[PDB]
Chain A
Amino acid sequence: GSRRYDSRTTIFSPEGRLYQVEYALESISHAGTAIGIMASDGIVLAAERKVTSTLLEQDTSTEKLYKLNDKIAVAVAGLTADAEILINTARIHAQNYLKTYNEDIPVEILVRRLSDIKQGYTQHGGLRPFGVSFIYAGYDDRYGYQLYTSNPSGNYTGWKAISVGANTSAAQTLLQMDYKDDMKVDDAIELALKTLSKTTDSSALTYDRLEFATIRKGANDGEVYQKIFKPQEIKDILVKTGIT
């Protein structure tokens, strides 16, 4: 029968590893680098677009940075199509929580549930896992500003600064060097861009090959604002830090 053609996506290797999870991570390692940096007064999300063409419409485009609700955003590394399936699920889960409790969802709860979905694809169903790693940037009134990452295994962890996708080894070393705990948002913006500028496989880092976003309390009095940067705004912040 059909047994002949089954790849057996949810099995262990002799060494105790999940083949498909490991290979999905190998896929993600070729995706455009995404960096998250958490400051005391906000969070930065920076991501490098995958080898841009000059005729690509840059202003009305969304590849890396997605909004889950007013308080939580994600940076994507891997298959965009796979990520959008998970994003719409996460968007729904956040609204279910709000409908139930009349409170915005805590960041970790949203992360855990999205990670539990990924876990399911590695243990049952016989389907391939999602070839996606997320950086979650968000705020709630319990823990304040939070950075998380999840990967195809369904395992998630919290971070002060983190990178996913390509050149994470090099990127993480640079972040580990220059990061400190009393850091401000504007400093974190500069660190994020400087790190990408050194780890990039491109010749020079330009505005058209970047997506950028911040989550500050820079609105008026005790409230959070999400700023998905426009092309011209990325151009200005790139000049202001002295990269171009």
Chain B
Amino acid sequence: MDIILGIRVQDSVILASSKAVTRGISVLKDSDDKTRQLSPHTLMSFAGEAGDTVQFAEYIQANIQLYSIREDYELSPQAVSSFVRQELAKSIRSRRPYQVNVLIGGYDKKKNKPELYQIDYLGTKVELPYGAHGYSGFYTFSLLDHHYRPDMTTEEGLDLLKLCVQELEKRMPMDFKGVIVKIVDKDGIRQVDDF
């Protein structure tokens, strides 16, 4: 865990997540997918404490999938994010809190709008045009402040994202073994295989 990014453009949300899983002085894996599909039009990326991350992601995934079956209806990205926030807000005052930070990228089919939510382990939710967790933000936020425009296409968003990864690969101390990129739009969730 370490690098998770998010960019909301005109018609989609793009999430980029690092592939490295490191423990000690060993990179144990270089192809790790740090994300779970919560619903057909809602994707959550995650980063934080080992074990907690996946355990939390899969727990949320199960609850959203349960809701979908019960009501035969997909929850809006706003509704899923509020549910997730509340779970983390409970967690922080527990005996052992989930030390997990997340980005929730979703496409609201009723509004026909992409939405990106950034939620930290304390339960601090914000809707943003672009977001990041951990040390990544110290580079990417200023970069996106400069280069981001609200009316960009998905292809323009991917080039904007390439610009972030290049900067992180140049200035970050750790080797994060590239990123898996996923696009969330009106047609659902798909993975970019060549990045």
| Contact indicator per residue, chain B 68-79, by CB within 8 Å of chain A (1) or not (0) | 000101011011
Number of B residues contacting the other chain (C-beta, 8 Å)?
Answer: 10
For residue B153, CB closer than 8 A to chain A, the reply is: no
For residue B110, CB closer than 8 A to chain A, the reply is: yes
For residue A60, CB closer than 8 A to chain B, the reply is: no
Nearest CB on B from A45, distance (A) = 25
Q: How far does the alpha carbon of A141 sit from the alpha carbon of B78 in the complex, in Å?
A: 15
Residues in B whose Cβ lies below 8 Å from that of A109:
71
A103, closest chain B residue (CB): B79
Nearest CB on A from B160, distance (A) = 29
Nearest CB on B from A229, distance (A) = 33
Residues in A whose Cβ lies below 8 Å from that of B75:
101
Q: How far does the alpha carbon of A99 sit from the alpha carbon of B86 in the complex, in Å?
A: 9
Whether B86 lies near A103 (C-beta < 8 A) is no
Whether A101 lies near B73 (C-beta < 8 A) is no
For residue A17, CB closer than 8 A to chain B, the reply is: no
Residues in A whose Cβ lies below 8 Å from that of B61:
none
For residue A106, CB closer than 8 A to chain B, the reply is: yes
Residues in A whose Cβ lies below 8 Å from that of B71:
106, 109
Q: How far does the alpha carbon of A96 sit from the alpha carbon of B110 in the complex, in Å?
A: 23
| Contact indicator per residue, chain A 134-169, by CB within 8 Å of chain B (1) or not (0) | 000000011000000000000000000000000000
Nearest CB on B from A192, distance (A) = 31
Whether B83 lies near A101 (C-beta < 8 A) is yes
Nearest CB on A from B97, distance (A) = 19
Nearest CB on B from A110, distance (A) = 12
Residues in B whose Cβ lies below 8 Å from that of A54:
none
Whether A141 lies near B110 (C-beta < 8 A) is yes
Nearest CB on B from A227, distance (A) = 27
Q: A102: which of B73, B78, B110 is its contact (CB, 8 Å)?
A: B78
Q: How far does the alpha carbon of A227 sit from the alpha carbon of B82 in the complex, in Å?
A: 31
For residue A2, CB closer than 8 A to chain B, the reply is: no
Whether B73 lies near A103 (C-beta < 8 A) is no
Nearest CB on A from B83, distance (A) = 6
Nearest CB on B from A121, distance (A) = 22
The 8 A-B pairs at the shortest CB distance, nearest first, are namely A102-B82, A101-B79, A101-B82, A103-B79, A100-B86, A100-B83, A101-B83, A102-B78
Q: A: which residues have CB within 8 A of B?
A: 99-103, 106, 109, 141-142
In the complex, besides A100-B86, A102-B78, 17 extra interface pairs with C-beta distance below 8 angstroms are A99-B86, A100-B82, A100-B83, A101-B75, A101-B79, A101-B82, A101-B83, A102-B79, A102-B82, A103-B76, A103-B78, A103-B79, A103-B82, A106-B71, A109-B71, A141-B110, A142-B73
